[PDB]
Design a protein around this ligand. Structure first.
Ligand SMILES: O=C(O)c1cccnc1
Ligand SMILES: [Zn+2]
Length: 222
């Protein structure tokens, strides 16, 4: 089937601003696929853009749905999710999505444990703690499998992680140097199990989203 960066032993870095927007099944929703594994129904990581005035029929999240609103405002029957909002919609949940204004989101599908029932949304900046050596951290989500954070890095600040079970990063603002490479806004990085992350912010600092541990639990939708 469609297997995009489906060898989780390989590091990948992507300047996602260079990728073609491709059609999705939803009218007015286009996608930049980042990783994908499985047949008909997919464990998927994508950036997707909803056109202004997007209104759809309901859907259910058979494998869960996690996302960051990158720009604009996403909506459902429970209200607004403005840019900077992080959302977990666990397996078996449902809603009617839309976007009056349009939005762009970073979204993961079918990467929840089937038994997970934790659902919420969070302003990623609102619970940033005190800086520790120029890094402020907001704990977005943590369970026995994964740890999800938002990090704000002052200029020159270094985040070094030796977290187990894989490391995945999306650059939200500014830039970080990783392995001699400058990663700006919308760069996506996935590092295989055992590889340390060392990211140093540039002159304007940086903001990132980060998940660790999840590559131990890669599953094709059953
Ligand atoms: O990953 C995808 O293909 C995707 C995710 C959300 C909405 N449309 C497509
Ligand atoms: Zn949904």
């Amino acid at each position: 089937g469609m297997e995009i960066n489906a060898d989780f032993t390989k590091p990948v870095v992507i300047d996602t601003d260079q990728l073609e927007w491709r059609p999705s099944p939803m009218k007015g929703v286009e996608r930049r696929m980042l990783d994908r594994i499985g047949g008909e129904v997919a464990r998927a990581t994508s950036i997707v853009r909803y056109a202004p005035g997007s209104r759809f029929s309901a859907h259910t999240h058979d494998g869960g749905e996690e996302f960051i609103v990158l720009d604009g405002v996403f909506q459902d029957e429970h209200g607004d999710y403005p840019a900077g909002t992080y959302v977990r919609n666990p397996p078996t949940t449902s809603h009617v999505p839309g976007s009056a204004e349009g939005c762009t989101i970073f979204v993961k599908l079918w990467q929840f444990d089937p038994a997970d029932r934790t659902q919420f949304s969070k302003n990623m900046e609102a619970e940033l703690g005190a800086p520790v050596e120029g890094i402020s951290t907001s704990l977005l989500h943590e369970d026995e499998r994964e740890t999800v954070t938002h990090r704000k890095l002052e200029p020159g600040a270094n985040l070094t992680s030796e977290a187990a079970g894989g490391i995945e990063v999306l650059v939200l603002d500014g830039d970080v140097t990783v392995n001699d490479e400058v990663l700006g806004r919308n760069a996506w990085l996935r590092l295989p199990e055992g590889e340390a992350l060392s990211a140093t912010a540039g002159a304007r600092g940086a903001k990132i989203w980060m998940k660790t541990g999840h590559l131990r639990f890669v599953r094709t939708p059953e």
